[PDB]
Design a protein around this ligand. Structure first.
Ligand SMILES: NC(=O)c1ccc[n+]([C@@H]2O[C@H](COP(=O)([O-])OP(=O)(O)OC[C@H]3O[C@@H](n4cnc5c(N)ncnc54)[C@H](O)[C@@H]3O)[C@@H](O)[C@H]2O)c1
Ligand SMILES: NC(=O)c1ccc[n+]([C@@H]2O[C@H](COP(=O)([O-])OP(=O)(O)OC[C@H]3O[C@@H](n4cnc5c(N)ncnc54)[C@H](O)[C@@H]3O)[C@@H](O)[C@H]2O)c1
Ligand SMILES: NC(=O)c1ccc[n+]([C@@H]2O[C@H](COP(=O)([O-])OP(=O)(O)OC[C@H]3O[C@@H](n4cnc5c(N)ncnc54)[C@H](O)[C@@H]3O)[C@@H](O)[C@H]2O)c1
Ligand SMILES: NC(=O)c1ccc[n+]([C@@H]2O[C@H](COP(=O)([O-])OP(=O)(O)OC[C@H]3O[C@@H](n4cnc5c(N)ncnc54)[C@H](O)[C@@H]3O)[C@@H](O)[C@H]2O)c1
Ligand SMILES: [K+]
Ligand SMILES: [K+]
Ligand SMILES: [K+]
Ligand SMILES: [K+]
Lengths: 268, 268, 268, 268
């Protein structure tokens, strides 16, 4: 019997096999969870990617900017998991900011239309997914979202950092709503992970100076972390998400759990 | 000679004589500052209100959602203060959230179109005003915005709290940009102030339960504050803003100064 | 197989069956851990109390102010667990402040001799236990201490709050040292728990006003917590400690995990 | 008329002309304050040093570990400032940690006798000076202490960081007591300043690796600070202390004001 034996968990945010959500899904299945996946836009690709997970998982389309996708989401989940069953967990692993809001593009030059799209996808959608799915979640259930510590400004991340600050605030209000259902809501603040997008940025996709600054940020992270930090290994992040989905942190909600090697607790 | 003798300071956000910005402007003029005011929408009213300030102050129209107002703002300020002169200070005292995002209206029921408007006005505009005016600000100058501590969720304030979380993040990035000009950027986190809007909310304009919850929040504030808190007296807040506009906190930037009676430092 | 199957864990701090450490020990044994217990002063009582745990556990004497107890502690643990074996976990559940430092006795009237004793037992000993036991802890092991959120002042807790602030700082340095051994160090910040000492304080053992203030603090905690807070039930706290002792938060160190119902994330 | 015109302010902590307190005293006198100084141990030296201040200031002996010095302090101040007069301000600029608690000496190897002495001088004395002097402080007065941000661990500073964490907690309780007198209590968190002691440490007085680590910490501070940081110039710190001693932050108490160039608001 695994950490999540028999639990029904919805996992958003898989796009490649380097997505943090891919490893969340893998570890959850290793620990006995039965998954429902949601994917955005490139559903043929996502299906082929998730064929590599240890167990079969039904895939549902979900664009979090599409009010109609959200209005049907709960019914579509029930079609998959069966009438009379509910979800035990919800993983939000969704983030986006248009290029104008990141990289070497000046902070002041991001038009609000772009910033607003990034905040819609990266922060507001944490509330609207909770709105859609709380009516079909069991008492004792768990909502978990992915965070990148925005308490201090940093180069290049720019308006994505602002979106994460908003997300942390949203999580504290979602916890108030979720508590009425006996459900917890928490974020995992991860250290940097070399996803396909992050590797491309370090390669210069958003400008050379931005790539240079993000590379220096990654190096200092492993240096500061008392137990080190391996940006090529998302398994410690996936395990921490699974910890929050289990019943082993039953009095934690509205909160942020750091899976970052301890880097944020050290100055140098 | 006053605390701000001869300094040229732009003050946004006056709408009535109970606006926090009205008292910021009054105290700044008492301390020798020469003001330029900006007003939104109801310019005849704002002119009549600000006739009551101790000294004459030119009034310029500024809707922070209007890109054309922002694109001409610096030139219009220069017309007023004179070619060859620059601003020494910028006060952002602007906030708005549509009713769906506050009060008894459920947190989950605020459509993103409404939330996005509130974040545009209450958070993004801190960056876009800095973008407009930094080119005409003197070294040693000071940008100050108004904050309401969003580190914990609270009843009724709902998505306005999320907007303040975003604003605090924006301020840390504005400080990075402003530092290139020798300019500081900081927020003042004020305790609750009985503006006309807040009195109406306590009177029930956003629902009875929301009025009840905000009234209880005000009462606990004075109880927790080691030096007390008078929501009917914005002068301590105005004085703190003037402190940040002066040269007496010359090594503080990207930061938040609490003018709240000490309430946030006490649990009970 | 339990969450802690086969792990060897040292648990300090049991004095009665309402001690938080008693429930940590019970849950750890329920999850397959093999325990070594340490007790202070009243070893006959502690032996009789811990006879009620689900499994036998050897008991060692440890006064954390006694340098000789600490200098022999590792050897005495090895005698119990066997040459060639090491500990996988260390639970610090130790706190004390003389009466002058708590309650209605004025904050200014606690002599430093008393405060220093309380800081020795409640904060410094977290470092000196780590110094004693890290040489016999396995890579991947876990040190966990008990915290009560001291980020804001509160009535009655007085100098115990100061000792907890010191403890949080000590934990960040212990994490630096422990990382060299592949060991994590973290605190669990618990909500209030009705131990025998806390029930006596609420009954007035430290003065009537202090009992009144602590009772009001307990009530507001359950009110603020989005999932509620039951001060008569330490099991959620024990489970959270066991979570940190397991391998399921492998990238968290130098950190504080809140097992408080979410109360610290809400203002009202 | 200066910022502190006519105010009577007690200033502790001068030992050389590079002491932060020397520059606090200089700026306060430049702004019209009438000072009383306190000095520890080397009173002939301190007298000769403070002969260089712009105005004469009476010097009183105060060892904060000496209960008799503290028990007579208020009477000795009244002898100097005149019967019927009170203090308007109190500056605590006192810190000490024995060598075992800093530098390359291992964190675990500092005996508690040494740590306790450092916490007595650096943290507890903030409370005991407030206890001594609040009875002779005017309503509207101000107590200010010097802080070095201890929210994250760092190399070399070791147990001094723990003492600063305790000091921040003490300040929140002193604010509760001081509020009964209408007095504010706050800390200024300064960036690193090249005092004589700090120059010697960088020169290796506490070991080569500790000097190397502190030098790297200083360099990163100026790099992170959006307005830069000059460790050879304590005037911005002195000005910030004077700001808190004035009436221009009248609603701030129990709090920490950062005079650090904004460095703590930036990660890289
Ligand atoms: N270093 C890092 O990679 C890092 C660090 C900390 C936190 N995080 C966060 O982890 C989460 C997962 O990101 P990742 O790094 O695994 O990258 P990723 O690119 O693999 O995943 C981002 C996902 O967001 C999805 N998404 C984008 N727009 C969407 C929309 N309109 N509707 C639905 N889904 C949408 C994409 O389809 C993709 O699956 C994000 O919140 C990210 O901010 C990442
Ligand atoms: N208790 C409180 O009142 C409280 C507490 C802390 C902080 N604050 C903040 O102080 C600031 C001032 O608010 P207030 O309480 O004085 O209320 P207010 O209603 O008097 O001022 C709000 C101002 O925002 C302006 N504004 C709205 N939309 C605008 C737009 N599109 N363009 C330009 N200006 C626009 C309004 O015209 C008005 O002048 C706000 O940021 C508010 O969040 C208020
Ligand atoms: N509400 C609460 O009870 C609460 C809340 C949060 C955290 N905590 C913390 O949890 C921990 C356990 O306390 P508890 O509430 O279970 O109370 P408790 O009285 O049951 O346990 C305190 C323990 O400290 C031990 N101790 C005292 N002096 C010692 C010494 N010199 N050497 C060794 N051990 C010594 C006592 O023997 C006792 O076992 C403490 O750190 C406490 O501060 C308690
Ligand atoms: N980089 C820095 O120098 C730095 C940074 C931030 C904060 N601070 C703090 O500023 C304060 C002033 O330190 P400084 O850097 O100016 O160094 P300093 O050596 O010039 O001043 C320290 C003072 O503490 C006094 N002191 C020590 N033991 C005492 C006792 N028993 N009784 C009374 N006074 C005693 C000394 O006599 C001396 O005047 C300290 O709290 C220090 O921690 C310093
Ligand atoms: K490291
Ligand atoms: K009060
Ligand atoms: K509740
Ligand atoms: K810099």
């Amino acid at each position: 019997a695994g950490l999540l034996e028999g639990k029904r968990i919805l996992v958003s945010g898989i796009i490649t096999d380097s997505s943090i959500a891919f490893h969340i899904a893998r570890v959850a299945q290793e620990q006995g969870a039965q998954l429902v996946l949601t994917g955005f836009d490139r559903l043929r690709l996502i299906q082929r990617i998730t064929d590599r997970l240890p167990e079969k998982a039904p895939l549902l389309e979900l664009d979090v900017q599409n009010d109609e996708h959200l209005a049907t989401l709960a019914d579509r989940v029930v079609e998959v998991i069966g009438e009379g069953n509910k979800l035990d967990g919800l993983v939000h692993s969704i983030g986006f900011m248009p290029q104008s809001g990141m990289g070497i593009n000046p902070f002041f030059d991001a038009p609000y239309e772009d910033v607003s799209k990034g905040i819609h996808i990266s922060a507001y959608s944490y509330a609207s997914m909770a709105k859609a799915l709380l009516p079909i979640m069991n008492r004792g259930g768990s909502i978990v979202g992915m965070d990148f510590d925005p308490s201090r400004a940093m180069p290049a991340y720019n308006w994505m950092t602002v979106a994460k600050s908003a997300l942390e605030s949203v999580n504290r209000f979602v916890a108030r709503e979720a508590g009425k259902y006996g459900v917890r809501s928490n974020l995992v603040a991860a250290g940097p992970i070399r996803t396909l997008a992050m590797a491309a940025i370090v390669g210069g996709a958003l400008g050379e100076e931005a790539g240079a600054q993000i590379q220096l940020l990654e190096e200092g992270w492993d240096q500061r972390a008392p137990i080190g930090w391996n940006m090529k290994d998302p398994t410690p992040v996936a395990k921490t998400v699974c910890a929050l989905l289990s019943e082993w942190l039953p009095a934690t909600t509205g909160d942020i759990i750091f899976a970052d090697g301890g880097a944020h607790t050290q100055l140098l």
